[PDB]
Paper text:
GluA3, a subtype strongly associated with disease, functions as both a fast-transmitting Ca2+-permeable AMPAR at sensory synapses, and as a Ca2+-impermeable receptor at cortical synapses. Here we present cryo-electron microscopy structures of the Ca2+-permeable GluA3 homomer, which substantially diverges from other AMPARs. The GluA3 extracellular domain tiers (N-terminal domain (NTD) and ligand-binding domain (LBD)) are closely coupled throughout gating states, creating interfaces that impact signalling and contain human disease-associated mutations. Central to this architecture is a stacking interaction between two arginine residues (Arg163) in the NTD dimer interface, trapping a unique NTD dimer conformation that enables close contacts with the LBD.
Author numbering:
A (entry chain Y), H (entry chain Z): 6 to 39, 56 to 83, 94 to 161, 174 to 210
B (entry chain B): 485 to 509, 513 to 533
C (entry chain A): 534 to 553, 570 to 628
D (entry chain B): 583 to 630, 636 to 729
E (entry chain C), G (entry chain B): 789 to 828
F (entry chain D): 583 to 630
The structure:
């Protein structure tokens, strides 16, 4: 279980870092709205070309009202980051308490929920926008994939611990 | 303007504008992905 | 394509001595039945379980989805 | 199981727990909606270079020119717009000379260049030539 | 002519809601069984 | 089996003999053609 | 009206590529198992 | 075993001969191209009738450039011929080494791969065309079926040899 635990820890850290970078940076969308080739993020719009290179504005996000509010607050990407952090905390705490098996189950549940909320956040973002997609968007997607894989690994470790206990 | 300074023009009898003339000119092998947007395919995989 | 898919499914499901009483139910006759049932959208009595057999099944499923949907859509226009 | 369900096929196993059956049911509803939307006009989708002046300015593969003496060459000469200034800068030093003696000669040059030449002319003449045989030219942009 | 994600986002919301509901049901059953086992 | 094949619904049994599989295959082709022809414009006939 | 092979030639390419990939995977596993058996 | 192996050898030779003839001959397609009726193969067109009946002219082949290059090179029909030849060589060499069981498997894989490349070549030809098809087209189409049937036979022999070896 040492290799699986190492892989789970590395994947949890990688998913958390990727999602945090994706939320923090401003390379989500390569649109043209100021109109000279601006690259946008979840909160700012910066000009990649013209007389204003390096100036970052503030995105104005305002049924339709609910979608605008959810896109503005970015509750789902932030919630995914929070859930990934909690899953990493559970992974860390499972080492100190090697007898409480439900901690690794909690970690797996947190990782799966973080991936699901990342799906929801991507859906909300793409729906609210309606150009190309930058590397922050793909960082979020890769974070989703790694979160799902790490959740699978954590659930497998939980099953292995309970099977070994049953034997 | 340069012509108006030496000759008198009447009111226009036809409108125009400088335009671009070029010679005129089957989907790809992956045309089966066309009915849905690329975002839809990504979200379906996710 | 039906002939080739059935032959490759039988091959990847039965060639290796390290999986062999048959390891599965995927002789050439049953591979042909599986492919025909998949194409006709009539389900299958059996399904592949190996990685390579599941790759063959998945690509065949994608192929038959595209082809049957195209046939039905174009027939709706023909009618 | 998830793959065979979307592909509208089905596998040799099926969930038997309440939560597994909830997952299967919602995936089945998703598959129904998405596949019905996808395959509605699949056959239709299977059977189906320059957009403006900045496109001409930013490239080099296609040459462009105007008449030898006319309003368009003068318009490009005294224009203070950056894109038109660049276009005039290219035309002035273009070799062979891109300035044509007549509109018909420029149209013939466009037709015989195999898409390697663009002609800048008045919209009325472009609209006339576009709707005449051999119908091998078109107007791009506004 | 292609279909956009905005047109079919509701089915994605329904799918994720169903996944969350199934996870909640499974966890509730697990917790009840674990508490009953602990009492026994 | 034949009723389930026509409704494109499947059942819990399937032929295993060569002749039974020939019958199943021709019935499947018949069902595919007939159902594809039937369901093409069904709502148009319902509404009119 | 009748759509032709050129319209659907990509799916045939994907099918044959998948068949080749499956054969490659099966043969890689067979070679690995044969090496393991010979070493053992 | 002897009857099965005789069938395998005869089918391998028939498939090789059919594919070689289909590649080497010119009656692949009957088209009114050059505008007089003409029979065209893989490498040249010959006038079917008219004044210059019998004159043969090499094909003028020149996303789309790749398709025309593949069709002009005819890499897939020739690759099918080569794979059929290698499968026949394996079948012939299997008698020389009666204890090497993997030679039969090699022959089966070669025949299956030759059939698959035959499929690819047929698709490439028909796509690059965009009338009727001659007997060289249906020789290669027949060569595919035999190569797939001989590939099934060789795999059964490989299984039978190992089933015997296991007892």
């Amino acid at each position: 279980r040492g290799v699986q635990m190492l892989l789970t820890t590395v994947g949890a850290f990688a998913a958390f870092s990727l999602m945090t970078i994706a939320v923090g940076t401003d390379y989500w969308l390569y649109s043209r709205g100021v109109e000279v080739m601006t690259h946008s993020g979840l909160w700012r719009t910066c000009c990649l070309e013209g007389n204003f290179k390096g100036l970052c504005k503030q995105i104005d996000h305002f049924a339709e009202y609910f979608l605008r509010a959810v896109r503005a607050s970015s509750i789902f990407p932030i919630l995914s980051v929070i859930l990934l952090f909690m899953g990493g905390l559970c992974i860390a705490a499972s080492e100190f308490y090697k007898t409480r098996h439900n901690i690794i189950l909690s970690a797996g549940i947190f990782f799966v929920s973080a991936g699901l909320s990342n799906i929801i956040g991507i859906i909300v973002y793409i729906s609210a926008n309606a150009y190309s997609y930058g590397w922050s968007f793909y960082f979020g997607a890769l974070s989703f994939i790694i979160a799902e894989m790490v959740g699978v690994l954590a659930v497998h470790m939980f099953i292995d611990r309970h099977k070994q206990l049953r034997a | 303007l340069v012509r108006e300074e030496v000759i008198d023009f009447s009111k226009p009898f036809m409108s125009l504008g400088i335009s671009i003339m070029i010679k005129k000119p089957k989907p790809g092998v992956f045309s089966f992905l066309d009915p849905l947007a690329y975002e839809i395919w990504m979200c379906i995989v996710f | 394509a039906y002939i080739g898919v059935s032959v490759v499914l039988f091959l990847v499901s039965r060639f290796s001595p390290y999986e062999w009483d048959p390891p599965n139910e995927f002789g050439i006759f049953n591979s042909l039945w599986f492919s025909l049932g998949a194409f006709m959208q009539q389900g299958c009595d059996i399904s592949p379980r190996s990685l390579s057999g599941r790759i063959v099944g998945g690509v065949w499923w994608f192929f038959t989805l595209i082809i049957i949907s195209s046939y039905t859509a174009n027939l709706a226009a023909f009618l | 199981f998830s793959l065979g369900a979307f592909m509208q096929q089905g596998c040799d196993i099926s969930p038997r727990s309440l939560s597994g059956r909830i997952v299967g049911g919602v995936w089945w509803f998703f598959t129904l909606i998405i596949i019905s939307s996808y395959t509605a006009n699949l056959a239709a989708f299977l059977t189906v270079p320059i957009e403006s002046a900045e496109d001409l300015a930013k490239q080099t593969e296609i040459a462009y020119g105007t008449l030898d003496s006319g309003s368009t060459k003068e318009f490009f000469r005294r224009s203070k717009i950056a894109v038109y200034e660049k276009m005039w800068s290219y035309m002035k030093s273009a070799e062979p000379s891109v300035f044509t003696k007549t509109t018909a000669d420029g149209v013939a040059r466009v037709r015989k260049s195999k898409g390697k030449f663009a002609f800048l002319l008045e919209s009325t003449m472009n609209e006339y030539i576009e709707q005449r045989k051999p119908c091998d030219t078109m107007k791009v942009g506004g | 002519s292609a279909l956009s994600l905005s047109n079919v986002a509701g089915v994605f919301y329904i799918l994720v809601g169903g996944l969350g509901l199934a996870m909640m049901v499974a966890l509730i059953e697990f917790c009840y069984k674990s508490r009953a086992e602990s009492k026994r």
